[PDB]
């Protein structure tokens, strides 16, 4: 990919950050899905969700 005369751009996020994003999503799925409306947060433990 170097000798043939092109390049591959790095992604917009580091791996490390993509991850956070998924950690935040995993923390929020247990809470958002309890009542309609994104304004509040209700992060109940997963079993009761």
């Amino acid at each position: 990919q170097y000798v043939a005369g092109y390049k591959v751009l790095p992604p917009l996020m580091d791996v490390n950050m993509e991850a956070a994003y998924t950690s935040s999503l995993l923390g929020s799925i247990a809470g958002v899905g309890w009542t309609a409306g994104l304004s509040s947060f209700a992060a109940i433990p997963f079993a009761q969700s």
Partner: protein, 49 residues
């Protein structure tokens, strides 16, 4: 607007007592984008594109 705000999960008490401030907020929100028609707006950029 009052019925929709009741429907999106806001109680009728605060709507019944605070019409003036939410009216001012709505008017300011509508008036803000009137002068915002420039390069900073993404939809304006998409229209130009």
């Amino acid at each position: 607007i009052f019925y929709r705000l009741n429907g999106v999960g806001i109680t009728q008490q605060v709507l019944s007592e605070n019409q003036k401030l939410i009216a001012n907020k709505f008017n300011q929100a509508l008036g803000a984008m009137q002068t915002g028609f420039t390069t900073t707006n993404e939809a304006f950029q998409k229209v130009q594109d």
